[PDB]
Amino acid sequence: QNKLLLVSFDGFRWNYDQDVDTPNLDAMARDGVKARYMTPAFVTMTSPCHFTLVTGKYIENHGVVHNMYYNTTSKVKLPYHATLGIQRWWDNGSVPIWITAQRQGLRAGSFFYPGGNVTYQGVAVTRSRKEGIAHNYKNETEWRANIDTVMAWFTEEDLDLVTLYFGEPDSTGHRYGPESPERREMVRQVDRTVGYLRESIARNHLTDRLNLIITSDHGMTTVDKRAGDLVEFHKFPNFTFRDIEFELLDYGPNGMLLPKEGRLEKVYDALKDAHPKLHVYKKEAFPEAFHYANNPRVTPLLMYSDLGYVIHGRINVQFNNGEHGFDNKDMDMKTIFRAVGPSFRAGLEVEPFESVHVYELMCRLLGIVPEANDGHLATLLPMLHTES
Numbered sequence: 001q002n003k004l005l006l007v008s009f010d011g012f013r014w015n016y017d018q019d020v021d022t023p024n025l026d027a028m029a030r031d032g033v034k035a036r037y038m039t040p041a042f043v044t045m046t047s048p049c050h051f052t053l054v055t056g057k058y059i060e061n062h063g064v065v066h067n068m069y070y071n072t073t074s075k076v077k078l079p080y081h082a083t084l085g086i087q088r089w090w091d092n093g094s095v096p097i098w099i100t101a102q103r104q105g106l107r108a109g110s111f112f113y114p115g116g117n118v119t120y121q122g123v124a125v126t127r128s129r130k131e132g133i134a135h136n137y138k139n140e141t142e143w144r145a146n147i148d149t150v151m152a153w154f155t156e157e158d159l160d161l162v163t164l165y166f167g168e169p170d171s172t173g174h175r176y177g178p179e180s181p182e183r184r185e186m187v188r189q190v191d192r193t194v195g196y197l198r199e200s201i202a203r204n205h206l207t208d209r210l211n212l213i214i215t216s217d218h219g220m221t222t223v224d225k226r227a228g229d230l231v232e233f234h235k236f237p238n239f240t241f242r243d244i245e246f247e248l249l250d251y252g253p254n255g256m257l258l259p260k261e262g263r264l265e266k267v268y269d270a271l272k273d274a275h276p277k278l279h280v281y282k283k284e285a286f287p288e289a290f291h292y293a294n295n296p297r298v299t300p301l302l303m304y305s306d307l308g309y310v311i312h313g314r315i316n317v318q319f320n321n322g323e324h325g326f327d328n329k330d331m332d333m334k335t336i337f338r339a340v341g342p343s344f345r346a347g348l349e350v351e352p353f354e355s356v357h358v359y360e361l362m363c364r365l366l367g368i369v370p371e372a373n374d375g376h377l378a379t380l381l382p383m384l385h386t387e388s
């Protein structure tokens with residue numbers, strides 16, 4: 001059997017390599033497989049999309065419906081890092097790939113990967129590392145060290161699967177924007193890390209025994225501040241926050257709302273036409289194609305805004321130049337799928353696919369029985385060599 005290394009670079013847009021010199025990614029395209037682009041799950045958030053990659057399920061089905069743990073009764077809203085340690089958020093009836101693999105005699109590890117630092121139905125990941133609260137995500141010397149550690153897990157601790165997470169270029173994209181020179185310098189750093197990764201695989205004699213997947217969770221688009229028709233809840237005339245019991249706003253282009261008892265119809269009629277670029281739905285009427293709304297955790301009202309626009313609640317508190325979370329049909333939200341290894345063909349480009357199919361692939365690559373999921377293995381199977 002071959003080992004598996006899945007690497008994710010947060011917020012790597014499908015065409016980030018097109019206006020940057022990416023020698024190592026280009027080589028990996030020659031030596032392996034590439035998707036024209038990969039369509040992420042909706043919502044296009046970090047944690048929900050990452051969990052889809054390791055469960056093969058749409059977001060409504062695995063239950064991680066937001067970067068933030070929230071609780072409508074207690075009114076708690078925990079940011080991304082804190083939520084990485086809330087077990088009940090991730091252990092909601094779906095089983096990520098580490099746990100499935102370990103029940104079938106494999107050893108699996110998570111390095112900074114969302115959902116990998118908690119237990120599922122009482123089981124823990126064989127090896128797990130979680131970053132600090134104020135972690136620095138762009139330190140290249142730290143990147144190379146983490147790869148060294150992951151390599152030791154493969155060789156010294158007889159691990160078969162590792163999921164390794166990097167917080168760039170999402171961080172740099174957010175701060176300076178996806179079209180900035182800073183982003184491109186960060187993509188250049190990523191590309192150097194791809195080469196270090198492949199060189200580290202060869203140095204450890206795993207080139208012919210280890211399959212490598214390099215992907216991401218979503219893309220990134222610019223937020224124009226020059227635009228004037230901002231989505232501001234505090235400027236909706238016939239709407240009042242007096243009708244809201246719980247709210248989740250001021251977080252990119254996705255919002256949720258739980259009105260006080262009996263005021264749901266009042267709030268809805270106020271907001272359904274409030275802004276031509278804010279699409280508000282009753283939970284039942286939210287588009288099925290998104291595969292997002294039908295989860296008990298989602299609130300009776302949810303909404304999303306058009307590309308380039310974020311949702312402002314009581315007061316504007318968002319200043320990022322780039323954002324994600326938008327419609328997964330938007331090209332700017334599309335992301336990458338790259339892979340190389342003994343089981344993978346070479347020089348192959350495939351038409352786009354949804355990220356929900358990565359799970360079935362990884363399970364076939366590990367020779368394990370997949371949990372029931374929303375993907376289909378026939379989608380990505382052309383990527384693999386025919387056996388003899």
Ligand SMILES: *[C@@H]1O[C@H](CO[C@@H]2O[C@@H](C)[C@@H](O)[C@@H](O)[C@@H]2O)[C@@H](O[C@@H]2O[C@H](CO)[C@@H](O)[C@H](O)[C@H]2NC(C)=O)[C@H](O)[C@H]1NC(C)=O
Pocket residue numbers: 136139140141142145146
């Ligand atoms: C960038 O990161 C390197 C590496 O950080 C160290 O290794 C990590 C994997 C982790 O174990 C951290 O706790 C470590 O800090 C930093 O290099 C280290 O810097 C400190 C000085 O503050 C020193 O004690 C160590 O010897 C250094 N290690 C090496 C290999 O050089 C570096 O400081 C970081 N730089 C920035 C600007 O964040």
Ligand SMILES: *[C@@H]1O[C@H](CO)[C@@H](O[C@@H]2O[C@H](CO)[C@@H](O)[C@H](O)[C@H]2NC(C)=O)[C@H](O)[C@H]1NC(C)=O
Pocket residue numbers: 063088091092093296297
């Ligand atoms: C998944 O999480 C949801 C929400 O955190 C759980 O839903 C709650 O479940 C208990 C029943 O045990 C109720 O007391 C709450 O009122 C439920 N709230 C909602 C909004 O559904 C759900 O039980 C969890 N499921 C699993 C399998 O862990």
Ligand SMILES: *[C@@H]1O[C@H](CO)[C@@H](O[C@@H]2O[C@H](CO)[C@@H](O)[C@H](O)[C@H]2NC(C)=O)[C@H](O)[C@H]1NC(C)=O
Pocket residue numbers: 116117118119124125127128129130131
């Ligand atoms: C979450 O990650 C932490 C590391 O950030 C894991 O803790 C380490 O576990 C090993 C062995 O149990 C120890 O030698 C380290 O000293 C631990 N460090 C810290 C800071 O705890 C932890 O096991 C992970 N948790 C889960 C549930 O996987």
Ligand SMILES: *[C@@H]1O[C@H](CO)[C@@H](O)[C@H](O)[C@H]1NC(C)=O
Pocket residue numbers: 071072073074
């Ligand atoms: C939210 O917190 C409440 C309030 O303490 C708690 O009783 C319950 O476990 C949680 N409820 C839901 C629906 O998550």
Ligand code: NA
Pocket residue numbers: 017018019020021022023
């Ligand atoms: Na390039």
Ligand SMILES: [Zn+2]
Pocket residue numbers: 010011045046047170217218
């Ligand atoms: Zn992300």
Ligand SMILES: [Zn+2]
Pocket residue numbers: 011046170174324
């Ligand atoms: Zn982000």
